[PDB]
Design a protein around this ligand. Sequence first.
Ligand code: NA
Ligand code: NA
Lengths: 264, 260
Amino acid sequence: APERLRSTILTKDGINWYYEQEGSGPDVVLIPDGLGDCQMFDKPMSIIGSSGFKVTTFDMPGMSRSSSAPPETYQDVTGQKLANYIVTVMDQLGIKTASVWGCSSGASTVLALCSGFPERVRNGMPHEVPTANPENLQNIHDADPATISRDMAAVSRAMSANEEAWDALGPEVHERLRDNYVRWAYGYPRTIPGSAATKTEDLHKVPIDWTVGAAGPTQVFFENVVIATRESIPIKTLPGFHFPYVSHPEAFAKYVVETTRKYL
Amino acid sequence: ERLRSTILTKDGINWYYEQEGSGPDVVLIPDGLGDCQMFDKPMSIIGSSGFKVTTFDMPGMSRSSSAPPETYQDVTGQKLANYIVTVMDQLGIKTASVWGCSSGASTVLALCSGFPERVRNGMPHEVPTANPEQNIHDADPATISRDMAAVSRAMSANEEAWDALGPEVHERLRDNYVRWAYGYPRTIPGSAATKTEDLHKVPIDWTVGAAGPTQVFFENVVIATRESIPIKTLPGFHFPYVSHPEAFAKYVVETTRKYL
Ligand code: NA
Ligand code: NA
């Protein structure tokens, strides 16, 4: 049975990344959603990493156990900025090419990697790319930190589509997330959607297989379905909503594995 | 003034129908439960915008329930389109702007493909495209009614407005659920007229419900986008005319005005 490496690694951009690896074979990189906590991949990482892949994941810059990082790394955040940082960590880890998953700002990062670093991406798996600045979160940064944490915890839980799996992440994870919510609010929603690499010139350098959440309201990532279809990119639903790796870890892992096997 | 009446067409169907207003014709085809009282509020709003609005209970359903079995068994868009063109002929409706949800939408597409001379513009909403994941429909009829009333209420997105249809409507729906179950879900989804050759004989403006789970009518967004057909969300889910009658009426009116 493969064992899980859990460690830290420094990069030249100043970030002390917390990261984990499991398995052997072609590289698969699992980029977190905006909350930046890779413990949400723990279960499917074992599944994917037993299916003939070396899986790498990490907490995102400024978030959780990667919190030792320069402020610019988690402020005015864009897919392009995060893509640069991920290519730097790939270099340090000796990852030449990878099949890359990401949801939300993680998907913004997938698209920016596919556009800007196609030589490093075997195939991209974006899920629920933010494409508009959300109405409900228009002034979330302007609120007081305790309120940011409380309201964003509620929103995240509602977007999990499996409240029991979400809670079962456990108290350690939800304590880390408490602080991340604030840093996320300050650094992500105002800049991430406008950074989406969703032009024709972004989307056809490498293979892309796009997903949205089956249980999300049609309205929420509607434009993802439009963009992918207009561009003739494979688009389908996954079980759950915004955290498929938490709500439905087996189906998530199967998706990642079958999709990646297409391009081996 | 709302006209409420009946006609026997040549398919053997004793239709219950309603008409209100003056102006270009707008036809509102029910969803698969087949009951046009769901249109009562928005029918008046549309009619007051300068249109003549016609609606009807569907064959075998509600007040149109006297009909031969073939009209409510093995139902397809194409069969329903044939029947509705005969209604149009009998009422003297030459061309119409046609709205429909669910099997109603299947009927819109079949009208647009099969009878383009008769359709000014089509407004499909939530066209069924996949067989509901049917072997279990050899249940008691009361069980079918129970389970289909629950599904329908959950697809309304405004449970208070759904309940507010009132007992007369829900008592009609009770028997309609059973007929619908036996006649519609195995055959309607395959009948969807969604080939490129079906979809470009008249203008179409496609909608899905903003609040429906993405997976349910996902493929509608794909098809419409692939074909460069206008596609957008309406408030609510599967019964916008019930949940959001004002937004619904405004949509039908503004869309129809595009083509005048
Ligand atoms: Na590549
Ligand atoms: Na026409």
